[PDB]
Design an enzyme around this catalytic site. Sequence first.
Site, short mmCIF file in Angstrom:
data_model
loop_
_atom_site.label_atom_id
_atom_site.label_comp_id
_atom_site.label_asym_id
_atom_site.label_seq_id
_atom_site.Cartn_x
_atom_site.Cartn_y
_atom_site.Cartn_z
N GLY A 202 1.49 -1.44 -0.19
CA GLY A 202 0.08 -0.26 0.18
C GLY A 202 1.03 1.06 0.02
O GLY A 202 1.92 1.02 -0.06
N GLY B 112 0.08 5.07 1.14
CA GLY B 112 -0.69 6.11 1.48
C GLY B 112 -0.77 7.69 2.03
O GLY B 112 0.55 8.31 1.44
N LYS C 130 4.27 4.81 2.58
CA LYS C 130 4.03 3.18 2.19
C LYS C 130 3.99 1.54 3.54
O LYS C 130 4.69 2.32 4.32
CB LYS C 130 5.64 2.60 1.34
N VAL C 131 2.93 1.00 3.24
CA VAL C 131 2.69 -0.55 3.89
C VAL C 131 3.54 -1.32 2.42
O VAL C 131 3.87 -1.77 1.73
CB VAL C 131 1.30 -1.12 3.86
N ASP D 20 -11.53 4.31 12.56
CA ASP D 20 -11.77 4.33 11.56
C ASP D 20 -12.42 3.44 10.47
O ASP D 20 -11.84 2.43 9.55
CB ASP D 20 -9.61 3.67 11.30
C1 LIG Z 1 -5.89 8.95 11.34
N1 LIG Z 1 -4.06 9.24 11.49
C2 LIG Z 1 -3.86 8.53 10.27
C3 LIG Z 1 -2.17 8.21 9.88
N2 LIG Z 1 -2.15 7.29 11.52
C4 LIG Z 1 -1.49 6.64 11.20
O1 LIG Z 1 -0.85 6.53 9.78
C5 LIG Z 1 -1.61 5.37 11.66
C6 LIG Z 1 -0.18 5.60 13.51
C7 LIG Z 1 -0.78 4.91 14.29
C8 LIG Z 1 -0.62 3.86 14.22
C9 LIG Z 1 -0.81 2.83 13.07
N3 LIG Z 1 -1.36 1.74 13.17
C10 LIG Z 1 -1.07 1.34 11.62
O2 LIG Z 1 -0.56 1.31 11.09
N4 LIG Z 1 -1.31 -0.11 11.66
C11 LIG Z 1 -1.25 -1.32 10.92
C12 LIG Z 1 -2.81 -1.17 10.18
C13 LIG Z 1 -2.99 -2.69 8.42
C14 LIG Z 1 -1.37 -2.83 8.45
N5 LIG Z 1 -1.64 -3.51 6.98
C15 LIG Z 1 -2.02 -2.50 5.83
C16 LIG Z 1 -1.14 -4.83 7.43
C17 LIG Z 1 -1.20 -5.68 8.19
C18 LIG Z 1 -1.47 -6.50 8.11
N6 LIG Z 1 -1.26 -7.45 7.11
C19 LIG Z 1 -1.52 -7.07 6.31
N7 LIG Z 1 -1.97 -7.29 5.18
C20 LIG Z 1 -2.36 -7.11 3.77
C21 LIG Z 1 -1.88 -8.02 2.91
C22 LIG Z 1 -1.93 -7.35 1.09
C23 LIG Z 1 -2.25 -6.00 0.94
C24 LIG Z 1 -2.54 -6.00 -0.54
S1 LIG Z 1 -3.72 -6.40 -0.56
C25 LIG Z 1 -4.80 -8.32 -1.06
O3 LIG Z 1 -3.84 -5.92 -2.04
O4 LIG Z 1 -5.19 -5.93 0.17
C26 LIG Z 1 -2.93 -5.32 1.75
C27 LIG Z 1 -2.67 -5.64 3.49
N8 LIG Z 1 -1.57 -5.62 6.06
C28 LIG Z 1 -0.24 -1.83 8.28
C29 LIG Z 1 -0.61 -0.73 9.81
C30 LIG Z 1 -1.33 3.87 11.97
C31 LIG Z 1 -2.68 7.66 12.85
C32 LIG Z 1 -4.19 7.67 12.72
#
Ligand SMILES: CN1CCN(C(=O)c2cccc(NC(=O)Nc3ccc(N(C)c4ccnc(Nc5ccc(CS(C)(=O)=O)cc5)n4)cc3)c2)CC1
EC number: 2.7.11.1
Length: 278
Positions: free
Chosen positions: A28, A30, A34-35, A142
């Site tokens: 991803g 955003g 990047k993720v 969210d």
């Molecule tokens: C309002 N503001 C905005 C700014 N803000 C933040 O930026 C922020 C701040 C603090 C904490 C966090 N927490 C996280 O960032 N958590 C997180 C959650 C989920 C994932 N992902 C994406 C995960 C996790 C696990 N597995 C996958 N698998 C996967 C496999 C394949 C595909 C491709 S497909 C098949 O095309 O769908 C996609 C996914 N993805 C990564 C991290 C965020 C805070 C609030």
Amino acid sequence: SMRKSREYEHVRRDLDPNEVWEIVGELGDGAFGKVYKAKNKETGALAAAKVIETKSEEELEDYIVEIEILATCDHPYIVKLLGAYYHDGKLWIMIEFCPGGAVDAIMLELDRGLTEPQIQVVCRQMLEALNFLHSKRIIHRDLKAGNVLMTLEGDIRLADFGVSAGTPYWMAPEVVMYDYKADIWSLGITLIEMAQIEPPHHELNPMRVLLKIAKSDPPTLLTPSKWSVEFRDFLKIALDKNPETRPSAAQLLEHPFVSSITSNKALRELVAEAKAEV
Ligand SMILES: CN1CCN(C(=O)c2cccc(NC(=O)Nc3ccc(N(C)c4ccnc(Nc5ccc(CS(C)(=O)=O)cc5)n4)cc3)c2)CC1
Ligand SMILES: [Cl-]
Ligand SMILES: [Cl-]
Ligand SMILES: [Cl-]
Ligand SMILES: [Cl-]
């Protein structure tokens, strides 16, 4: 002056994450960063890594509070935080890899919505996730199909934060004009999103979405005869514009639409299908 601690159990500093994790792809990209998909160099274990160039120390602090909140969410249907790093101006958030990806990405890939039995498992698991968070006084804030990640076994993991596969389709009327009830409204919107691929008001000028939420009656399924009386009733009561009368997650878990859901099979089959199409 009085000062804040910058020591947090779930954030390690001055360690290059790249010594520990190999990036093996992109999941991803955003507005916040990047993720990546990552593989542990020592064990082969898989993670998602969300990587942010944080501008301000205030920003960093806001994010870290969220990481620390996640670190206390030990529930089987919520993403598992491995931990975080802050290195080189970059905050890395490591989550246990869910290999099935997000429900909306699955819908777009297959070009179709979930069956009602698939929506039943997701709803059931989401409510359990929510009931848990609300009881620890956590508001999710969210919820959307893009936050529902899938494992191979057929369970969800609810992402604290996610991106749709940002117009605020899921926003509660009270917020349109902070309380746990707003998450219930967004769940309702998410279920319609899963039923119909796109959430209500997808067709509008995004500039009008909030206006439309405020002035309109709550949304309903487009083709009601396609769906069970249970499902239409669940929505009716979840999509209550008055947060006071809107039911809690605890109350919803006893609704006939989900009270008897004990097997993930419907969903397990959906992930299997989406795995063959890629
Ligand atoms: C309002 N503001 C905005 C700014 N803000 C933040 O930026 C922020 C701040 C603090 C904490 C966090 N927490 C996280 O960032 N958590 C997180 C959650 C989920 C994932 N992902 C994406 C995960 C996790 C696990 N597995 C996958 N698998 C996967 C496999 C394949 C595909 C491709 S497909 C098949 O095309 O769908 C996609 C996914 N993805 C990564 C991290 C965020 C805070 C609030
Ligand atoms: Cl870690
Ligand atoms: Cl309008
Ligand atoms: Cl009913
Ligand atoms: Cl509540």
